[PDB]
Ligand binder design. Structure first.
Ligand SMILES: [Mg+2]
Ligand SMILES: [Mg+2]
Ligand code: NA
Length: 356
């Protein structure tokens, strides 16, 4: 059943709406040619991070606000039309939600300024129930301006479906929770409980930002915003064991951003902001999971988020300050990038996601 649509992905773009952005923008993106087409948009305030549901029928976005407007919005999504239809919104009761994840039964946010995480059950229609849990953290780190309190920046469900790991930029920790896979809107069971250990500690002043796992779930990789380092870990049965620390940033910019593995697992990419904005490229040793830097690609300004297409052919960079999504072709044998000069104009893009 080959179709033109096979290579056509639906892309969701989250933004900051302090300027001309309406909120969420949707596009068709061809992962074999790099061509794109605008589809629709949704008026949503500060949807700086969003996710599709696993079946692609729903989209959930944060509403990143410093006070009482902090929330999550739930939408019905039509992948073919690229249309978003708001279902409802619920308050996080934790300032600046900046990341979210789902297991199909609950949504979890990382509240940056609240220094907390919020759990929302998902109703039978895909809409959100009011928060069922708000988990507060305590502590600080050595950075005088950035680590005065916990700052939750990432929430990830482990590849074995058993744990939730939450990156805390403010305290140099990855908090660990046990997941109750049965917890849902109907039974009202608690989703998260503190695990053993309650947290993993990383080098002081690192500022843990985003965490990813490899395809078989035996390795994890963390990008540290302040330290500008990538930490490689061995992952097994709810344990993170540090195996290597490498420098993503080499100019002490203290603005590292996002992290992604190529789908074939052969290369790791990590972005840097503020100085020498771009993407560091590492070759992954497939057996021991360690990294060796192989290159660097300068990008537009403020690459807070990027994504790799499922076929591994393109790497798309959201450049918040240049108001563009830059498209790079990947050389699958060297990991190196080539700007194909097919930029997508978007005001303050900060989150890219695909729906197949
Ligand atoms: Mg315990
Ligand atoms: Mg330091
Ligand atoms: Na390049």
């Amino acid at each position: 059943d080959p179709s033109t649509t096979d290579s056509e992905l639906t892309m969701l773009v989250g933004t900051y709406t302090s300027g001309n952005s309406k909120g969420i923008y949707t596009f068709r993106f061809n992962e074999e040619t790099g061509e794109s087409l605008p589809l629709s948009d949704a008026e949503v305030a500060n949807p700086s991070y969003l996710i599709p549901s696993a079946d692609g029928k729903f989209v959930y976005s944060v509403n990143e606000f410093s006070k009482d407007q902090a929330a999550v919005s739930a939408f019905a999504f039509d992948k073919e039309k690229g249309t978003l239809h708001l279902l409802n919104t619920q308050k996080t009761m934790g300032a600046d939600p900046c990341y979210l994840t789902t297991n199909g039964k609950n949504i979890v946010t990382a509240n940056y300024s609240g220094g907390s995480i919020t759990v929302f059950p998902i109703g039978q229609d895909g809409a959100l129930l009011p928060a069922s849990d708000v988990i507060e953290f305590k502590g600080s780190g050595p950075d005088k301006e950035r680590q005065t309190m916990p700052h939750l920046h990432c929430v990830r469900i482990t590849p074995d479906g058993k744990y939730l790991l939450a990156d805390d930029l403010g305290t140099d920790q990855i908090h660990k929770f046990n997941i109750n896979p049965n917890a849902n809107a109907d039974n009202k069971e608690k989703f998260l409980t503190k695990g053993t250990p309650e947290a993993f500690k990383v080098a002081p002043g690192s500022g843990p930002r985003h965490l990813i796992f490899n395809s078989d779930g035996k390795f994890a990789y963390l990008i540290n915003e302040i330290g500008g380092t990538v930490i490689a870990f061995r992952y097994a049965d709810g344990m993170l064991d540090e195996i290597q620390t490498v420098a993503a940033d080499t100019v002490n910019a203290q603005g590292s951003g996002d992290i992604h593995l190529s789908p074939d697992g052969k290369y790791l990419y990590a972005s840097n902001r503020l100085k020498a904005d771009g993407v560091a490229i590492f070759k992954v040793d497939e057996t021991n999971g360690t990294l060796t830097k192989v290159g660097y690609q300068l990008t537009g300004i403020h690459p807070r988020n990027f994504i790799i297409t499922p076929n591994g052919k393109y790497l798309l960079v959201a450049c918040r300050d240049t108001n563009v999504i830059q498209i790079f072709e990947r050389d699958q044998a060297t990991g190196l990038l080539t700007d194909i000069k097919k930029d997508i104009k978007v005001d303050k893009p900060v989150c890219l996601k695909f729906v197949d």
